[PDB]
Design an enzyme around this catalytic site. Structure first.
Site, PDB file in Angstrom:
ATOM      1  N   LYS A  17     -17.230  41.062   5.832  1.00 13.72           N
ATOM      2  CA  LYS A  17     -17.820  42.479   5.977  1.00 13.72           C
ATOM      3  C   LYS A  17     -17.089  43.457   5.611  1.00 13.72           C
ATOM      4  CE  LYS A  17     -19.405  44.666   9.882  1.00 13.72           C
ATOM      5  NZ  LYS A  17     -19.820  44.934  10.601  1.00 13.72           N
TER       6      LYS A  17
ATOM      7  N   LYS B  47      -6.269  51.376  17.635  1.00  9.32           N
ATOM      8  CA  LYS B  47      -6.151  52.894  18.359  1.00  9.32           C
ATOM      9  C   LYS B  47      -6.831  52.590  20.145  1.00  9.32           C
ATOM     10  CE  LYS B  47      -8.804  57.000  17.989  1.00  9.32           C
ATOM     11  NZ  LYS B  47      -9.803  58.006  17.388  1.00  9.32           N
TER      12      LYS B  47
ATOM     13  N   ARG C 166     -16.434  43.464   1.929  1.00  8.72           N
ATOM     14  CA  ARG C 166     -17.848  44.830   1.825  1.00  8.72           C
ATOM     15  C   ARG C 166     -17.940  46.559   1.995  1.00  8.72           C
ATOM     16  NH1 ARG C 166     -22.373  46.121   4.402  1.00  8.72           N
ATOM     17  NH2 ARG C 166     -21.789  45.027   6.658  1.00  8.72           N
TER      18      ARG C 166
ATOM     19  N   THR D 269     -13.920  53.684   4.701  1.00  8.63           N
ATOM     20  CA  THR D 269     -12.796  54.451   4.404  1.00  8.63           C
ATOM     21  C   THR D 269     -13.085  53.016   3.150  1.00  8.63           C
ATOM     22  OG1 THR D 269     -11.684  55.026   5.818  1.00  8.63           O
ATOM     23  CG2 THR D 269     -10.431  54.269   3.745  1.00  8.63           C
TER      24      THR D 269
ATOM     25  N   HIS E 237     -15.006  47.824   3.012  1.00 11.62           N
ATOM     26  CA  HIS E 237     -13.804  48.929   2.092  1.00 11.62           C
ATOM     27  C   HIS E 237     -12.723  48.352   1.513  1.00 11.62           C
ATOM     28  CE1 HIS E 237     -13.853  49.760   6.948  1.00 11.62           C
ATOM     29  NE2 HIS E 237     -14.014  48.817   7.564  1.00 11.62           N
TER      30      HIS E 237
ATOM     31  N   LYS F  67     -24.009  55.044   7.852  1.00 12.26           N
ATOM     32  CA  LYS F  67     -22.720  54.919   8.877  1.00 12.26           C
ATOM     33  C   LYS F  67     -22.152  55.921   8.785  1.00 12.26           C
ATOM     34  CE  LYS F  67     -18.809  51.746   9.371  1.00 12.26           C
ATOM     35  NZ  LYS F  67     -17.496  51.038   8.873  1.00 12.26           N
ATOM     36  N   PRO F  68     -21.394  56.667   9.831  1.00 11.90           N
ATOM     37  CA  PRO F  68     -21.181  58.152   9.975  1.00 11.90           C
ATOM     38  C   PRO F  68     -19.548  58.045   9.192  1.00 11.90           C
ATOM     39  CG  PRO F  68     -21.928  57.200  12.260  1.00 11.90           C
ATOM     40  CD  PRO F  68     -21.305  55.801  11.329  1.00 11.90           C
TER      41      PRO F  68
ATOM     42  N   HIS G 176     -11.349  44.366  10.151  1.00 12.60           N
ATOM     43  CA  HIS G 176     -11.405  45.649  10.836  1.00 12.60           C
ATOM     44  C   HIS G 176     -10.090  47.396  10.196  1.00 12.60           C
ATOM     45  CE1 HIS G 176     -11.615  49.728  14.130  1.00 12.60           C
ATOM     46  NE2 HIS G 176     -10.657  49.454  13.797  1.00 12.60           N
ATOM     47  N   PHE G 177     -10.965  48.246   9.863  1.00 10.61           N
ATOM     48  CA  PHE G 177     -10.453  49.173   9.106  1.00 10.61           C
ATOM     49  C   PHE G 177      -9.423  49.760  10.068  1.00 10.61           C
ATOM     50  CE2 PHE G 177      -8.278  51.357   5.301  1.00 10.61           C
ATOM     51  CZ  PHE G 177      -8.115  52.958   6.259  1.00 10.61           C
ATOM     52  N   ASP G 178      -9.104  50.504  10.885  1.00 11.94           N
ATOM     53  CA  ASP G 178      -8.549  51.383  12.266  1.00 11.94           C
ATOM     54  C   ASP G 178      -8.588  51.901  11.793  1.00 11.94           C
ATOM     55  OD1 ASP G 178      -8.950  50.564  14.766  1.00 11.94           O
ATOM     56  OD2 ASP G 178      -6.646  51.230  15.036  1.00 11.94           O
TER      57      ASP G 178
ATOM     58  N   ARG H  46     -17.635  60.211   4.583  1.00  8.44           N
ATOM     59  CA  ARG H  46     -17.814  60.879   5.805  1.00  8.44           C
ATOM     60  C   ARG H  46     -18.986  61.642   5.607  1.00  8.44           C
ATOM     61  NH1 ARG H  46     -14.871  61.784  11.403  1.00  8.44           N
ATOM     62  NH2 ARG H  46     -13.275  60.603   9.884  1.00  8.44           N
TER      63      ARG H  46
END
Lengths: 124, 124
Positions: free
Chosen positions: B7, B66, B10, B45, B12, B41-42, B119-121, B85
């Site tokens: 995921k 974060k 896909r 990146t 990032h 998806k708001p 996860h992209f933080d 965005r």
């Protein structure tokens, strides 16, 4: 209790300097801005531009916030900022931060009248 | 169901290009990577570096996520990235994105064995 606007200023505004002054900038600032009191705030960004310039972002590029809210704004220009993030040797109440200086667009959520920043969402 | 690692890839990874190719890059990519299917998806990146380079970040600078988790890592170097965005004219199922190209450090959360990004933080 702080107003949302004043809390933004406390957490995120540093117009006294054009950029982080040393690798210890975040350790000093996270402490003096009261972000290590009850816990180590894990991540926090300071903006080195005037308050007027940061407030002006609320009239700039309307974009979605990371959580889907529609009241976020991206600065048209890049700004001098510092990212502060806890590092491995950090254990409350001994908080330790990495200082990372950069120049990028900031994204903030705005609320109220006057319409002013109340949350730092991200920088790009 | 996707593995957490797949995921991440896909959502990032875009090693096919050195940087966003046009102002329409995000509109195209958010769609083809299936990020506009059930909703817009708001914020998202893409990283324009090899998969090996992005995976390597999990062995780089350990920093807090974060949300306070301790399994986040910041890239030692800057990387070519694109921030996508949602903009004002965006309404599901007609999703519209602003494309913002940049070069910065990326921060990812890593998990598993092999220890890889899930996860992209943020980027700094």
């Amino acid at each position: 209790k702080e107003t949302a606007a004043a809390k933004f200023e406390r957490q995120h505004m540093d117009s006294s300097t054009s950029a982080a002054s040393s690798s210890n900038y975040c350790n000093q600032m996270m402490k003096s801005r009261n972000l290590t009191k009850d816990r180590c705030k894990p991540v926090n960004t300071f903006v080195h531009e005037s308050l007027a310039d940061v407030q002006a972002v609320c009239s700039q590029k309307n974009v979605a916030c990371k959580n889907g809210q529609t009241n976020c704004y991206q600065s048209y220009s890049t700004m001098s900022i510092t990212d502060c993030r806890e590092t491995g040797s950090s254990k409350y109440p001994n908080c330790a931060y990495k200082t990372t200086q950069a120049n990028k667009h900031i994204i903030v959520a705005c609320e109220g009248n006057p319409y002013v920043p109340v949350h730092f969402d991200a920088s790009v």
